[PDB]
Design a protein around this ligand. Structure first.
Ligand SMILES: Nc1cc2[nH]cnc2c(OCC2CCCCC2)n1
Length: 283
C-alpha cells in the first residue's frame, strides 16, 4: 500500500471506498478499491485477473497485505451516471447510445462465454473515456467476496428468490440501463423489494405460468400478488425506434431461458448501422 499515494475519494461503493491514486514507482494513475481474508476469494479474484477484454475494466493487481485486501484497476474519468446527469437536458444522441450498448454487449458476451457474471450492473459501474469506449467494472466480484443479494436494475428471478440464477440476470440489467439512456429517467425506480417487483409488474404485466413456466413455484412468489396488464413499449421508451424496442423487449423477457443472450443480441438488426462516435466530455 505504502506504494500508493491517494489522490481523492472517488466515492463509496459496494465493497468499500474507491480512491483515485498514483503508483509511486510506475507513476501510473489508478483506481484503488479497499475491500471491506478467505482463501476462496483470493483464488477467485486471482482468476478474474486473467480476464482481459477491451470492454472490461482491467484488474491490474491484487494486493493482500495485513489481513486487508485492495484491488487495483485501470482508471477512467467518468461513470455513465455522471454522463447522463450531464446530458439530462439534451439526452444522449442515439448513435452514441447504440455504440455503448453494442460495446457493453461485447463485454457481457466475453465474460459469459467464460461463465462469469456481474450480478449488479448499474450506470455507476459503467465507465467511459474520451475515445468513445465504455467498459464494465466489478465483473465477477459479487460471487467472490460472496456478496449477498440499488434494486432498480435487479432481474425478476433474483427478486423472486431464485438462488441459482444465470448470465441472463446481466442482460436484464443492461436492458434497464438501455431504457434509462433513451428516456433520461430510470425504468424501475423501486424503493423496496416489493415496490421493485410491482413496478416491474405494472409495466410488463404480472408474470404467470403462460409467459414464464415455473414462476408460481419460485420461493418468494405469492398468489396474492395483484395482477396487472402489460403496457406497450411504444409508451415505455417512446422515441426509441422499432428495432430498438424489439431488442429491448427481448432483453426484458421474464423467462430467464427465453431472454436474449449477449451474443445473439450482437446480431440484432438494431446494430446493422452501428458506429463509434466520440462523446463530449468535461473532465
Ligand atoms: N474514474 C473511475 C475509474 C475506475 N476504475 C475502476 N473503478 C473506477 C471508478 O469508480 C467510480 C465508482 C462510481 C460510483 C461510486 C464510486 C465508485 N471511477
Amino acid at each position: 500500500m505504502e506504494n500508493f499515494q491517494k489522490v481523492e475519494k472517488i466515492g463509496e461503493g459496494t465493497y468499500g471506498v474507491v480512491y483515485k491514486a498514483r503508483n509511486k514507482l510506475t507513476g501510473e494513475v489508478v483506481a484503488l478499491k479497499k475491500i471491506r481474508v478467505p482463501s476462496t476469494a483470493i483464488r477467485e479474484i486471482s482468476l478474474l485477473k486473467e480476464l482481459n477484454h477491451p470492454n472490461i475494466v482491467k484488474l491490474l493487481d491484487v494486493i493482500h497485505t495485513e489481513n486487508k485486501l485492495y484491488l487495483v484497476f485501470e482508471f477512467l474519468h467518468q461513470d455513465l451516471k455522471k454522463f447522463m446527469d450531464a446530458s439530462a437536458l439534451t439526452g444522449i444522441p442515439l448513435p452514441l447510445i447504440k455504440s455503448y450498448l453494442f460495446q457493453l454487449l461485447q463485454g457481457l458476451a466475453f465474460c459469459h462465454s467464460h461463465r462469469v457474471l456481474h450480478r449488479d450492473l448499474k450506470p455507476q459501474n459503467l465507465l467511459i473515456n474520451t475515445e468513445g469506449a465504455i467498459k464494465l467494472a466489478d465483473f465477477g466480484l459479487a460471487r467472490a467476496f460472496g456478496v449477498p443479494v440499488t434494486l432498480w436494475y435487479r432481474a425478476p428471478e433474483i427478486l423472486l428468490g431464485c438462488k441459482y440464477y444465470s448470465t441472463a440476470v446481466d442482460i436484464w440489467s443492461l436492458g434497464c440501463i438501455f431504457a434509462e439512456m433513451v428516456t433520461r429517467r430510470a425504468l424501475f425506480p423501486g424503493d423496496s423489494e416489493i415496490d421493485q417487483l410491482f413496478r416491474i409488474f405494472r409495466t410488463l404485466g404480472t408474470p404467470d405460468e403462460v409467459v414464464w413456466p415455473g414462476v408460481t413455484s419460485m420461493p418468494d412468489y405469492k398468489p396474492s400478488f395483484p395482477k396487472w396488464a402489460r403496457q406497450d413499449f411504444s409508451k415505455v421508451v417512446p422515441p426509441l425506434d422499432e428495432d430498438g424496442r424489439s431488442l429491448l423487449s427481448q432483453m426484458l423477457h421474464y423467462d430467464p431461458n427465453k431472454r436474449i443472450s449477449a451474443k445473439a443480441a450482437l446480431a440484432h438488426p438494431f446494430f446493422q448501422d452501428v458506429t463509434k462516435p466520440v462523446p463530449h466530455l468535461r473532465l
